[PDB]
């Protein structure tokens, strides 16, 4: 399988720098052109730099004026992207891409490397249960939720009863409110499975290593 393998997710503080790597297998990078493309959260695509591994020649979009440095090592079949003076506008997914290495096929893109630049510290999410107030009126069906607030960094893992409920579930995209993320989830079940059968909310934070379960009552 011809493929481009990129280094892992990056979490850096502003002012710092970070070097991303991309290793090709299936072809020699010296026989094509290697690039790095950037995609900001829920945004578009931007080409950053290009390099010819055969002679080390590079091309840069003037906007990444000497903040981005592209290099390549034919011996390890690897291309790199160095980014200095990291700011939040630098947070994004970075893809390395190869021009078609062989006649008969298209280009090659890596899995992407997510870079997050924040000053925030690791903070566990606080999970709160969302259940109907005193009275209730819907018949046949009911909706319950969960509030995951003030956590960093992404992501959090929410499931209802360990994957038991995989229908009628709505876990919304987190939101950044002053360096911290907050998200909420809802699920709907027939009023015949609740409140008799327990419905649980399981939110886990990979970073702070927190695992909390919120029972909807």
């Amino acid at each position: 399988e011809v493929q481009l393998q990129q280094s892992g997710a990056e979490l850096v503080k502003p002012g710092a720098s970070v070097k991303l790597s991309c290793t090709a297998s299936g072809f020699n990078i010296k026989d094509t052109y290697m690039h790095w493309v950037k995609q900001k959260p829920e945004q578009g695509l931007e080409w950053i730099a290009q390099i010819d591994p055969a002679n080390g020649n590079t091309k840069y979009d003037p906007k990444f004026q000497g903040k981005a440095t592209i290099t390549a090592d034919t011996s390890s079949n690897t291309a790199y992207l160095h980014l200095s003076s990291l700011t939040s506008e630098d947070s994004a997914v970075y893809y390395c891409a190869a021009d078609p290495p062989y006649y008969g096929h298209g280009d090659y893109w890596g899995q992407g490397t997510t870079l997050t630049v924040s000053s925030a510290k690791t903070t566990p999410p606080s999970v709160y249960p969302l259940a109907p107030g005193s009275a209730a009126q819907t018949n046949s069906m009911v909706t319950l939720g969960c509030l995951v607030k003030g956590y960093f960094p992404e992501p959090v893992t929410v499931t209802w009863n360990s994957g038991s409920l995989s229908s009628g579930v709505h876990t919304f995209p987190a939101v950044l409110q002053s360096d911290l993320y907050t998200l909420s989830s809802s699920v709907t079940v027939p009023s015949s499975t609740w409140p008799s059968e327990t419905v649980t909310c399981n939110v886990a934070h990979p970073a702070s290593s927190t695992k909390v379960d919120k029972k909807i009552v």
Binding site: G44, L45, E46, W47, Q50, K59, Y60, D61, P62, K63, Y95, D99, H105, G106, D107, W109, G110, Q111, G112, S126, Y128, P129, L130, A131, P132, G133, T143, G145, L147, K149, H170, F172, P173, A174, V175, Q177, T182, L183, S184, S186, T188
Partner: protein, 212 residues
């Protein structure tokens, strides 16, 4: 910097319908150096059409491409559910190489009103020293909707944060969540909390609230 402009920005096509989107460049580029990419949330952009009119490996024959100079387009003879995505045109003609702003293709379905549900701050949360009021508006169509928070007859604008989900894979509907976050006191210091959702499915708004 050859700028590429894609029209339309967003669009919906009922199943089986014919679709067409355009890409226009600030200056002319070779038709051989103009390509289109398809991207779905969470994965890398994938080559869809290369050199203006050629289909990439595995791309369905219902797709086509055409153009030269500064005007190009992508077409789907018949809309199918898996066509739903964001398509970007790209010029690899002169550097800096650029991409268009993209065209998001969504699925058109029969309108459906929003199922609203509001919730008050948990004591767990209240004792922590804060108060968040949440309101879900689930499974509706189209995506167009407005949400208002009326804290004691005096709409609260600031402190509200929303989040929308992508078009649902099963029913092709949308959903939204609004969260009003006040402080400890601010919340109990009032007692009328309302979530008002106005959706094109009905003139009469949908309201939900609670007291204390």
């Amino acid at each position: 910097d050859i700028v590429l402009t894609q029209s339309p920005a967003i669009m919906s096509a009922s199943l089986g319908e014919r679709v067409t989107m355009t890409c226009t460049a600030s200056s002319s580029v070779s038709s051989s150096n103009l390509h289109w990419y398809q991207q779905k949330p969470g994965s890398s952009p994938k080559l869809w059409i290369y050199s203006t009119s050629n289909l990439a490996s595995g791309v369905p024959a219902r797709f086509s491409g055409s153009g030269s100079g500064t005007s190009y387009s992508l077409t789907i003879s018949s809309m199918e559910a898996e066509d739903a995505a964001t398509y970007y045109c790209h010029q690899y003609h002169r550097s800096p190489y650029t991409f268009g702003g993209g065209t998001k293709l969504e699925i058109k379905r029969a309108d459906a009103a929003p199922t609203v549900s509001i919730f008050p701050p948990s004591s767990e949360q209240l004792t922590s020293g804060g108060a968040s009021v949440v309101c879900f508006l689930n499974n509706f169509y189209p995506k167009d909707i407005n949400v208002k928070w009326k804290i004691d007859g005096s709409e609260r604008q600031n402190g509200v944060l929303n989040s929308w989900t992508d078009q649902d894979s099963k029913d092709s509907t949308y959903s939204m969540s609004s969260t009003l976050t006040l402080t400890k006191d601010e919340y109990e210091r009032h007692n009328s909390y309302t979530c008002e959702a106005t959706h094109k499915t009905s003139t009469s708004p949908i309201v939900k609230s609670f007291n204390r």
